[PDB]
């Protein structure tokens, strides 16, 4: 259902806080679920749990761990409907009331929900018991594997992608309530016609019994339209249009009204007005050319590992007006929901995109031994949940559907194939891409015409002409003359960077060295301009963040133009200067 | 010859100071060393020249260099003989006076020189260029392999050791005048009967036309034996023997005498009176066992590279005494002669190194498109030279042949078979080693059996079982019960050691960091004095220091346990602990 708000027929609660902890172990306490959890350790919720404790043994956990807390359900919730929502549990949640499974979640990244209405009363308090899973598959979303050491018979994690596989509750927990007759979901698609907006939308609501008003309320808090009905198509008179450096957001009010005009339950719907189209080599918003400038970000801060923070992405947002970024990528995952709303506010555009990372063994990575049709099944879950969250952004302009994928062996083109098609029947309204890894070049990729828009990443002057940029720049434009000389379609770099070290300074041509992340930049950029096709540039990363465990990690990718504590490094002087005075 | 030094029949001049610096080019100049070289550049020649001029194309230059200077030779040196000496130039060298090519010299790191009394006057000013190569081929004591990059024609040096190609002339030059009836070279060798020292000496000199006298004085310029003739055996009551930890050095003065008893030369050679032994398992330094504790060094300092530098020097020396360790490891090249003189008289012990590192491609690395027959010939002048340069050290105390061979391949038994036998021929004073790499285990490597004491290179901490140190734990011991079990010999440890940033921590277990290299050398010595059959243990690296350029290299190689400058990391304390609370 719809992200829960507070409404005059709706009340909100917060399960945020420390709740009860405890991996799970191999004693006769199977099940820990049945009854009050016995642990000294509390963990904070809106949080991964990995460094947390400061504990080898819960960072290095594979499988299962145990939340717990209780609850009380309002005495003046009798008469409603009522539900317990987690955002989101990396990678597999579970719900449990009082002992009693009532939700079993498997992406990673996306919001689940139990109603609980007839399993506890109003006014009663019960244990809520949520166990979460770490573990990859070759068909979880990021796939990977376990393995056991020999030596020690320690469980290890393996997968294929950089990030740090942190697990937990890593987004926020609540009890909240709805009427009988409810809102449950609301579609709105956005057209312009001249000076003239139309809003097509869709209300979804557990009964017909009683019917459907919609207002749309303007910034200045004037009602600027109105319809009847669950579904329809209204025009408003010159338009506000949301755009990418000035937001503008309606207001849509969706109400369930009885026979005498009373409203039993409304629903707030944020609306931005604009049209995303891709015409040639050209990306188009609001029927005029758009450049992508910005990054590649990650979920990721000092101690709650992926868990969302306020201030971490008021002020993430706030470096990236200071630079003059207009967009970033939900790097490898869906983001928590609150930065694509304010996105929507900020006026920031972003590639949206699925948990599909690491398909890729560079052994046939698309066979039935590896990412076969049951990863798809698992795949094409991901895109639905994906779509079903974010499809009312404005700022969302693009679905990424994967990352780095193996996109040059057989099998890659069977296995893509519907998935782009599913996107766009879902979604009508976005173009959908996916981001191109180094290997499947323009002559060895087999799945890109069936995109509509190309990203790729490159890591030319780090990775392969290691720091022989003139090689690197010679190799790089070779790359691009081949992709635009083979598709008539947008090129947006979604990856290009060097690790970088914070102090680390070297007058000559050094890697590790913040002299070399500015030149290797700079470099790429003189080629992207070279060439009329491109339509976005997008560093990686915005920020270092951490990986597993690697001789050639750094204690992470520090490819950030800031450090994880978000101090800048001197390339992100070098595109602050580049993006505040280019078009 | 002997090292040169200033005696009353001998004088000595210093060339080192700026010089006219030039890369070689493709100008209508083709032969620099004809006449003055035209350039504004100076390079100081005690130094590597690659860091000096913050220059990228000296930097990665690849090929020939001219160093020019005028020099005068003393009017009051006719009636003498003197010659130009290099220390070394690395990789290759060649003097020129005055447009006369007059040495041709190959190897990277021991002395070279020509006479030049018959082409240039006493009291003469000459032009002297001095030519070095830094190109390495399969053929070359380190070897390695020239490129071109595609694109660009840049001509790039391949190479399969760690540490950068630095070139030059990282040692000092010198003008120096000899009599005609001089002495040319010396032998020592020192055993003892009892209370008595016995000292085996030969003088090779210029001529026999008048004679040789040999004196032996002790620290106190009491002359304490005295002998007649080019060879033979000088008895000392009650010998002050050199001892690790306490040096003692008597002091040989080879004289020529003429038919009156008047001084013709002499020479002054510093000597130790030490025996090592190599019984079953036990080192034995003057029949007591002994246990190696230090490093693996490197020539490299910030600027001037490999250039020998007696600041750090005397430093480094002390930094040693600081935290206890008795000795280190001229890890892949010899070290600059005045390093092995400090050696002897700081009482500190030496594994003394050939340039012969990287002997492996891990295609077969010993076949005739590989290491083959005429390496092997490069191997044994390296091996001739540097025994004949460093014999009389008593300081040094082993030999080593090589690091990280692919000693598990096939042909790596006859290629390596003649080395030993080389070696303990030319000098059977001591044992013979070489530095086992992780893929000859003990049931793969096939030619320990030809040495007296096993050295061996291990990172199961870092590069295998990476950060699982109960793992890695597991893994050292089953390997070392492995040697233990097949070889009657003293096993060293040479390399082991974790990249580590210099204020990067953490309180778990994370790589890189400075708590991570403190638990892996902690946990090392904790399986080291498991095994009786241990006989030392160094750590590597003393110091961080540069190497190529790489993504896994962050501005160098950081296993030092000091940093570059020379400051403590967190492990340079836990060895300090150690070494100075057991013997
Ligand atoms: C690592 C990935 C998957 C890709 O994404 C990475 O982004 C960041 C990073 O690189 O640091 C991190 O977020 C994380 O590490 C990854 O998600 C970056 C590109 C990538 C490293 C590829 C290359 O860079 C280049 C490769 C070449 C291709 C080719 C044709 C060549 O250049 O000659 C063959 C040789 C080689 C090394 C094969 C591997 C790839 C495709 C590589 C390393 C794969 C992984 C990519
Ligand atoms: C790099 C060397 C030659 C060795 O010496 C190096 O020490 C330091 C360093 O590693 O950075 C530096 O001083 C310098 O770079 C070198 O002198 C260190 C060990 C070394 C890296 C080996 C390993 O660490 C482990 C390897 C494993 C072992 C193997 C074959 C097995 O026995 O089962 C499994 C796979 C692998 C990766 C094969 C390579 C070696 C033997 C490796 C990397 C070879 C090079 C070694």
Redesign the interface.
Same mark, same amino acid.
């Given at each position: 259902m719809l992200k829960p708000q507070q409404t005059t027929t709706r009340d909100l609660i917060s399960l945020d806080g420390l709740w009860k902890f405890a991996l799970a172990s191999d004693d006769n306490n199977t099940q820990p679920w049945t009854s009050q959890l016995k642990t000294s350790l509390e963990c904070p919720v809106p949080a991964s749990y990995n460094?947390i404790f400061?504990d080898?043994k819960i960072?290095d956990h594979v499988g299962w761990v145990y939340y717990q807390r209780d609850v009380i359900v309002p005495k003046g919730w009798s008469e409603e409907r009522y539900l317990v929502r987690c955002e989101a549990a990396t990678h597999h949640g579970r719900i449990y009331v009082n002992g009693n499974l009532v939700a079993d979640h498997v992406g990673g990244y996306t919001p689940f929900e139990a109603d609980i209405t007839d399993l506890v009363a109003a006014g009663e308090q019960f244990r809520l018991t949520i166990a979460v899973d770490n573990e990859l598959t070759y068909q979880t979303i990021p796939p990977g594997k376990v393995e056991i050491? &020999?030596?020690?018979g320690?469980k290890?994690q393996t997968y294929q992608h950089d990030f740090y596989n942190y697990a937990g509750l890593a987004r926020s927990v609540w009890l909240y309530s709805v009427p009988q007759q409810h809102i449950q979901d609301i579609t709105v698609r956005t057209d312009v016609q001249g000076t003239t907006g139309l809003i097509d939308y869709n209300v979804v609501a557990s009964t017909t019994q009683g019917t459907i008003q919609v207002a749309v309320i303007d910034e200045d808090g004037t009602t600027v339209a109105t319809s009847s009905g669950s579904n329809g198509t209204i025009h408003i008179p010159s338009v506000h249009l949301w755009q990418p450096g000035a937001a503008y957001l309606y207001q849509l009010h969706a109400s369930i009204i009885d026979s005498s005009k009373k409203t039993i339950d409304t629903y707030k719907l944020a609306t931005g007005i604009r049209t995303v189209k891709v015409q040639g080599t050209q990306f188009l918003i609001n029927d005029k050319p758009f450049y992508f400038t910005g990054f590649g970000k990650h979920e990721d801060t000092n101690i709650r590992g992926k868990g969302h923070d306020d201030a971490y992405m008021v002020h993430d947002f706030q470096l990236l007006h200071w630079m003059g970024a207009n967009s970033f990528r939900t790097s490898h995952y869906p983001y928590a929901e609150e930065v694509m709303e304010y996105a929507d506010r900020q006026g920031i555009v972003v590639i949206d995109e699925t948990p599909a990372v690491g398909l890729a063994f560079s052994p046939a990575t698309f066979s039935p031994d590896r990412i076969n049709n049951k990863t798809r099944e698992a795949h094409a879950q991901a895109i639905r949940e994906l779509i079903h969250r974010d499809k009312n952004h404005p700022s969302v302009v693009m679905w990424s559907i994967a990352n780095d994928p193996a996109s040059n062996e057989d099998g890659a083109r069977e296995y893509f194939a519907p998935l782009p098609k599913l996107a766009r029947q879902l979604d009508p309204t976005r173009p959908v891409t996916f981001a191109n890894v180094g290997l499947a070049t323009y002559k060895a990729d087999r799945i890109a015409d069936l995109f509509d828009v190309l990203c790729l990443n490159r890591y030319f002057g780090?990775?392969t002409?290691?720091? &022989?940029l003139? $090689?690197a720049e +010679? +190799?790089l434009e $070779?790359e691009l003359r081949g992709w635009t000389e083979k598709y008539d379609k947008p090129i947006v770099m979604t990856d290009y960077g060097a @690790?970088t070290?914070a102090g680390?300074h070297?007058?000559? *041509?050094?890697?590790?060295?913040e002299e070399f992340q500015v030149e290797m930049l700079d470099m790429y950029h003189r080629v992207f301009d070279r060439f009329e096709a491109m339509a976005g540039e997008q560093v990686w990363n915005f920020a270092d963040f951490q990986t597993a465990?690697? *001789?050639?990690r750094? @204690?992470g990718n520090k490819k950030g133009v800031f450090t994880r504590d978000r101090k800048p490094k001197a390339a992100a002087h070098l595109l602050r200067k580049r993006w505040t005075n280019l078009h």
């Open positions: 460094d400061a080898s960072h050491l &020999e030596a020690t320690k290890v780090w990775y002409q290691t720091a &022989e003139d $090689e +010679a +190799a $070779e @690790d070290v680390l070297s007058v000559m *041509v050094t890697p590790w060295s465990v690697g *001789v050639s750094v @204690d």
